[PDB]
Design a protein around this ligand. Structure first.
Ligand SMILES: CC(C)(COP(=O)(O)OP(=O)(O)OC[C@H]1O[C@@H](n2cnc3c(N)ncnc32)[C@H](O)[C@H]1OP(=O)(O)O)[C@@H](O)C(=O)NCCC(=O)NCCS
Ligand SMILES: CC(C)(COP(=O)(O)OP(=O)(O)OC[C@H]1O[C@@H](n2cnc3c(N)ncnc32)[C@H](O)[C@H]1OP(=O)(O)O)[C@@H](O)C(=O)NCCC(=O)NCCS
Ligand SMILES: CC(C)(COP(=O)(O)OP(=O)(O)OC[C@H]1O[C@@H](n2cnc3c(N)ncnc32)[C@H](O)[C@H]1OP(=O)(O)O)[C@@H](O)C(=O)NCCC(=O)NCCS
Ligand SMILES: CC(C)(COP(=O)(O)OP(=O)(O)OC[C@H]1O[C@@H](n2cnc3c(N)ncnc32)[C@H](O)[C@H]1OP(=O)(O)O)[C@@H](O)C(=O)NCCC(=O)NCCS
Ligand SMILES: NC(=O)c1ccc[n+]([C@@H]2O[C@H](COP(=O)([O-])OP(=O)(O)OC[C@H]3O[C@@H](n4cnc5c(N)ncnc54)[C@H](OP(=O)(O)O)[C@@H]3O)[C@@H](O)[C@H]2O)c1
Ligand SMILES: NC(=O)c1ccc[n+]([C@@H]2O[C@H](COP(=O)([O-])OP(=O)(O)OC[C@H]3O[C@@H](n4cnc5c(N)ncnc54)[C@H](OP(=O)(O)O)[C@@H]3O)[C@@H](O)[C@H]2O)c1
Ligand SMILES: NC(=O)c1ccc[n+]([C@@H]2O[C@H](COP(=O)([O-])OP(=O)(O)OC[C@H]3O[C@@H](n4cnc5c(N)ncnc54)[C@H](OP(=O)(O)O)[C@@H]3O)[C@@H](O)[C@H]2O)c1
Ligand SMILES: NC(=O)c1ccc[n+]([C@@H]2O[C@H](COP(=O)([O-])OP(=O)(O)OC[C@H]3O[C@@H](n4cnc5c(N)ncnc54)[C@H](OP(=O)(O)O)[C@@H]3O)[C@@H](O)[C@H]2O)c1
Ligand SMILES: CC(O)(CC(=O)O)CC(=O)O
Ligand SMILES: CC(O)(CC(=O)O)CC(=O)O
Ligand SMILES: CC(O)(CC(=O)O)CC(=O)O
Ligand SMILES: CC(O)(CC(=O)O)CC(=O)O
Lengths: 405, 409, 404, 396
């Protein structure tokens, strides 16, 4: 009954630490006991003292977001804004430990606001899963590909795929062959969820159905890296993954001068030679921007997104052009083809992250139009990336990078 | 003064919300006031109710880690281990909201442990900065490239570069031309720091010195994306950035079967067709792995690293093959050429993150040998990625991916 | 001559003045020789008894002669129950010998099988609208079945063979890149497709008068530059071929073992290409085969850039897993049997050796499709032989013998 | 054995004649051979160096573009092609450059490479080998073994990368006037044999492990260079852009940025930041006995354009090609017609006084000609003249 007694009972080599909660009836106590057990295995027993753990809702975490829990990690949250986007104003929450990130993003928002605001559009929406399957011969895999490309073959596959969820709907298939191997990229809507588990479940049922028509087919892995999830890949850049978005703004010369502390000409010379030529010299696929990843990461951590998806979600091409009467105003656009995001599921099930989603008006399911909350969040991310690009690029043009962060 | 009064003064004097801490005495109250000012601008005024802010040390955060602070975001931290690596045992902290991640990584550690442990080696260590400068003509930039390629030219540059720090020591230069533009990749050690600020500071000094020899040289940007920082780039994959690490282990056939629920043969087939052929089909540069990004991200967030660096720090090639007298055992290796990490600076200045660094035995500076703590952390990251790769690949091979996520995610 | 040098007349306009193609070439050679450091240089560059009338207006300008490229033959290549004698134009010693060796291994193994997976040449122009919100509108428009229909009608009206199949539209702010993919009969199709694109864009401009057409090619095709889009989406013909080589053949013909071949294939064509940061280059030397057949058959040799895209795979097969299974997948073979260099006689001769010259009157596209299958199958033969030489340590030795 | 005909018979020509007769019987259309030329060609120089099982030769039309005014010299550039408009377009670009006062170029680097794959029992062992290779002493003994195989192959550096227990070693070496693949391969084989003496547990898997990288697109070639890395530039007068190129400097720049930078980025290109460098490279290569299959990496190029002059009306242009694989001795350059084209450029054979200078000069000509090609095509694209020019010169 006491923690000490429980620690002894467990230590009889009888019970693994990860099973503590399913033994006691209070999540926090399981965490407390795991911490005690862990302490005696550390070269510095008192190192956990500064890792917080009390008064946190572990009931929402267990069975959904983390195992073998020992506490939580507080990440400072700052706010940038208002971000004037599509005739609305957003106060953007950003979780980071990088000094100057929030300040810089706030400054970009200020330049956009004084510039009359930004406009964005969602160009596409579809999470993907790319399993790898194999047939006895390439002649066979070629036949399966041809079958999948017929309207009836696709129809059969879509029915099986769509049956696994209320929101997952198969839009298309991109099939690629490597000898007897066949990589099938399933692309589907997923309501307001980022959709990975949903799409994977749909894929699983669709492959089972395909097997009925081709019993010789061997499913090697539900993910054959053709999705592509959490690894850099030209396929995400070119075909899109999740939400594809574009945003733009014109910053008046006076604003570029007073808020950004530079000139339109200087910003354009840096953008072309850094974000286009520089990224090209570095052999980048999708990295034609200054720091989209910083903004994507901060918003993702703050809003319960999958931070590991910053790998592909940060894909962005930032463009700048002289505009206006005397070509002294700055036109800027950011195009992000693969923002993997959601307002339902995963980390968005937790209360603090729901608070940040509420701050933006996109928490949970959009009752009146499924998928609209996720689309709106993707639009906010793209616009905030643009605000960040504006400020960092201005700092680089003026020579202010080092002097601040 | 009261909260209402402080607010009225703010609005009235049109005062920046970000300057509140310089106005009030206590940091927490400034955050409270900021939250109050913000609540009035929200469509849902009660939004901040469940966003915590009390009892946190904001003094360490201000002027170093975040601005316009409205609270903190708690990320669950779990533990995977022991990770048996280089004759040592590590208890690895992982901050995540992805169910199954800690369980899977823990399973991989268990497999590695029953197999006698993993071995790792740091192959290179050097953070980089790649500014872009321009000359009047390409014939001029070609001259500058030649000059930087001389032992004497490199000497003068190294001298200026190193003068900015007790730890930043320039190791080499990689210079490339694009017409009249010249991209110079400075590569330098940085003690136990990730080094981005340190290196940028040294680069700025070296460029000023370069300018004394070539006054017609225009310095366009201290970062010309040739570093490359926080964007996918072949240069990081091929030349490395930060720490280049390799690790390996052999998992006995019995362990692959009982712990991983599959076979060495199935593991190899999935690895080759997914991590090699699959990534090739997808057009990946550096993504020849299953989920290195998951492990990298979780450890980074737990240990005060820069999570946005997951972009390049996640580069990894995971390889598997048959081993042992009967070729029944599973040999696995993970090679990560660009792990950007540090144990001093940035978020590692915060106490909770120092707690996770302390669990690993790598918090702060290694006074006896600057850089040893950061190197050790890089080894732990590579070994943990390897544990994670082992478990996910096994789940993919056995058809357990979706099922496991239905239970824990 | 004194005339030309006086009036400063350009050498390229010589054929107009003269009434003989060959005499125009002769006089151009004389003018050129005077300007050279060594005037006797042109002596060994042949020009006589060649039909310049076929070249003029179709294949080359300011002509001074022709360059003979040695042509060798490899085969029989036993593919899809047919046997081919493949002509290869090259100056690289060992290439024909090695390819011939691969054909022999394939033949003793019972032959190769191939399939054409897709067929569509592309053109990717770049256009721009005043704003990104405007370009997004055009992209949505092109994605409606009605929008696509009007664009297709305009495109297809420029030709009896070019038939638009699909569009892939992508945005970069206010810029819009539109990848037109179209069948092209037996032609490689670049001119046909560019013509169709030009007409299609004019039609789109009727609907969006604020649209500026920047360039008929905005590099989103992509033609003659390495690009992930060709590797991923295909371009021209996507083909796959395979074969199983008996263990005994691998030892006797290839001088190696199935295990050694597999180990080299995985660590070189997969792991090494990944270490090198390759997109589409998961093979040993597909480019050598493609180039040699292309030059021999009047193809556009500059398209070796993307046509060479290939992933070569190897695995153990058979009763005791001692036989060698091999497959080569080429998603972007840009090829044709009508148009361009295929209008010339010697190159038509090489196409005729393969039985694919000119138009397949009863089913346009069949001759080009067959040629694409032969290319893929020949690449596979070449892949087998070079990989065996690499596994056994024979590369440098063979080149000292046949390539020096 | 048909390929041994020349061994038994007298004349090379008769052997080709007989092989052709043998082949005839295997063709479904034997009369096709009637239009494949074979008579009166120097087969002696071909056998043992450039081709096997020879049945004749393929004539490729050769046109000339120029003069190309480059580095205070003038070159008449030979181009073998069947693409109508190519020579005309390249000639126009040359004309524009000449009227602009000529182009200037620089060779930035020179080193052919070979990237074998070897393997050790463990990654810990491969890590040790990598570290040894990174010492001046390790490099020194490897260079000694490598260099002993040639009078021209001189090892310059090594780039070693591992993937677990596998080790990829990129050897970079000078090669006199030769493109150097054979020379570098021979040096690599000896250097690996020596490395094995230091590390007996090392398995040499393949002399080429695709880390070179030869004839496959690869970021390593783009970033580190291969063969010759060259840059070229010129300024075209406003009146010339208008009169010769039929366009404006502003239109040129706009097309260049949006096609060659943005468009190539959209397509996911690594090294393809140009309009048609591959066309020029391929035509010169075929005419000059180069290895046309190397157009894969030799074509790598970034083309840049900016405004110049008092009112920004002149056009500045530069082309940067980091991986031109080329040579003036060896391979196809052993044949007479291709030697005639190399002689046209003044770079045929060995530069006896300074080995390496003829190949370096040829690489500069290639970069300069690509730049002339880029200028003309970009102008045609900006002006809307592409399709029209090809209907005129590239269609029977
Ligand atoms: C730090 C930085 C924002 C200061 O900008 P500045 O123009 O020199 O300083 P200013 O006092 O003139 O303020 C300009 C704007 O910056 C923003 N800003 C400045 N300091 C800020 C802070 N401490 N907190 C929040 N927002 C801040 C404000 O939105 C805006 O002023 P206003 O809304 O009160 O009218 C700028 O130097 C910068 O962004 N550099 C770092 C850029 C970067 O992105 N670094 C790499 C990624 S972290
Ligand atoms: C969830 C999962 C770990 C369960 O594995 P399993 O082998 O079927 O279950 P077992 O009960 O036999 O446990 C095997 C091992 O897993 C680990 N493990 C299992 N459940 C665990 C949990 N809830 N918490 C922590 N560790 C756990 C243990 O190290 C070890 O058990 P042990 O106490 O005997 O040493 C497995 O399905 C998995 O890893 N799936 C892949 C998830 C994944 O990697 N997704 C990728 C994105 S994170
Ligand atoms: C030169 C090479 C073909 C000789 O192969 P080999 O097996 O050692 O020699 P063999 O005498 O046993 O002949 C085996 C087969 O090779 C082929 N072959 C060999 N020499 C040949 C030649 N001179 N001409 C044409 N075909 C030849 C034949 O198809 C076949 O012999 P066969 O008449 O009995 O049917 C081989 O060493 C090789 O392929 N190496 C170079 C590989 C390569 O691809 N080079 C790099 C890219 S070009
Ligand atoms: C065909 C093309 C060269 C005609 O150019 P143009 O400017 O309209 O025609 P012009 O009569 O005004 O001649 C202009 C210049 O072009 C060159 N030129 C034109 N026709 C030529 C021909 N038939 N042969 C050789 N050179 C020619 C000349 O060098 C130069 O004039 P000059 O030397 O007599 O003083 C041009 O339309 C073009 O280059 N388009 C094709 C572009 C291309 O690169 N094709 C794609 C891949 S090959
Ligand atoms: N295993 C993997 O492949 C993988 C890969 C990367 C990340 N992840 C992890 O997966 C998690 C997110 O997965 P997920 O996005 O699919 O969440 P999920 O929690 O697995 O699925 C969403 C659930 O919410 C329900 N739902 C209700 N209203 C909805 C609405 N409006 N829109 C959408 N869904 C609604 C859905 O119903 P239905 O049951 O009817 O669909 C479904 O059960 C994260 O933790 C991430 O880290 C997993
Ligand atoms: N601006 C950018 O370009 C950029 C880009 C990406 C990330 N970042 C951010 O940069 C931050 C990290 O920068 P940083 O890694 O350079 O840390 P840093 O805090 O800026 O620099 C390290 C400091 O610690 C001192 N130090 C003491 N003992 C040391 C030891 N053993 N090893 C190393 N340094 C020691 C150094 O001395 P000296 O003064 O003598 O050097 C130096 O002052 C993160 O928050 C990250 O998010 C910045
Ligand atoms: N400018 C560019 O865009 C570009 C780019 C790369 C290469 N090229 C060059 O383009 C040339 C090849 O162009 P192309 O392939 O479009 O050839 P093409 O010669 O321009 O067009 C083929 C012509 O043959 C006719 N034709 C008759 N029977 C046919 C059949 N069965 N199949 C197809 N066409 C048939 C076509 O009819 P219709 O008139 O009814 O269509 C058309 O007039 C090469 O020389 C290449 O180097 C050009
Ligand atoms: N097998 C492969 O790895 C491979 C790959 C791609 C292409 N290739 C083929 O390789 C062939 C060319 O190979 P290579 O370039 O190495 O030529 P090479 O003909 O194999 O070697 C050049 C020979 O010329 C001698 N030489 C005399 N004067 C020279 C000078 N000034 N500069 C350089 N060498 C001089 C060299 O002397 P030393 O004996 O003292 O060195 C050597 O014997 C082409 O046909 C190409 O298609 C082969
Ligand atoms: C400045 C940068 O490193 C990002 C950062 O400071 O966090 C990105 C770049 O512009 O290269
Ligand atoms: C399973 C995976 O999606 C990662 C995850 O679940 O978080 C990665 C993959 O194998 O593609
Ligand atoms: C051997 C090779 O260089 C091609 C050749 O010899 O022409 C290709 C390779 O395997 O890297
Ligand atoms: C015009 C082009 O296709 C090349 C050619 O016509 O041969 C290249 C381009 O995309 O600009």
């Amino acid at each position: 009954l006491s923690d000490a007694e429980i620690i002894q009972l467990v230590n009889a080599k009888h019970i693994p630490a990860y099973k503590l909660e399913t033994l006691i009836e209070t999540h926090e106590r399981g965490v407390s006991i795991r911490r005690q057990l862990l302490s005696k295995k550390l070269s510095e027993p008192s190192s956990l003292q500064y890792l917080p753990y009390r008064d946190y809702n572990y009931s929402l975490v267990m069975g959904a977001c983390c195992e073998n829990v020992i506490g939580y990690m507080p990440i400072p949250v700052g706010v940038a804004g208002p971000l004037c986007l599509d005739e609305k104003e957003f106060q953007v929450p950003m979780a980071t430990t990088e000094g100057c990130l929030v300040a810089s993003t706030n400054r970009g928002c200020r330049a956009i606001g004084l510039g009359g605001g930004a406009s964005s559009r969602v160009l596409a929406d579809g999470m993907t899963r790319g399993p790898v399957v194999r047939l006895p011969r390439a002649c066979d895999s070629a036949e399966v590909k041809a079958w999948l490309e017929t309207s009836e073959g696709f129809a059969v596959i879509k029915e099986a795929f769509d049956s696994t969820s209320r929101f997952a709907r198969l839009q298309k298939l991109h099939t690629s062959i490597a000898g007897r191997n066949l990589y099938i990229r399933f692309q589907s809507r997923s309501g307001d969820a980022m959709g990975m588990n949903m799409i994977s479940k749909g894929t699983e049922k669709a492959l089972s159905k395909l097997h009925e028509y081709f019993p010789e087919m061997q499913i090697l892995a539900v993910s054959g890296n053709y999705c592509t999830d959490k690894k850099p890949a030209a396929i995400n850049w070119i075909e899109g993954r999740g939400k594809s978005v574009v945003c733009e703004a014109v910053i008046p010369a006076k604003v570029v001068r007073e808020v950004l502390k530079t000139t339109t000409e200087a910003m354009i010379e840096v953008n072309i030679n850094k974000n286009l030529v520089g990224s090209a010299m570095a052999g980048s696929i999708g990295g034609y921007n200054a720091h989209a990843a910083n903004i994507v990461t901060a918003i993702y951590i703050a809003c319960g997104q999958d931070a590991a998806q910053n790998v592909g979600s940060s894909n962005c091409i930032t463009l700048m052009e002289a505009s206006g009467p005397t070509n002294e105003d700055l036109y800027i656009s950011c195009t992000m083809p693969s923002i993997e995001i959601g307002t339902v599921g995963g980390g968005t099930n937790l209360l603090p992250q729901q608070a940040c989603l509420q701050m933006l008006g996109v928490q949970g399911a959009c009752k009146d139009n499924p998928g609209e909350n996720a689309r709106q969040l993707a639009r906010i991310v793209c616009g905030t990336v643009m605000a960040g690009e504006l400020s960092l690029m201005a700092a680089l043009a003026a020579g202010h990078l080092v002097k601040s962060h």
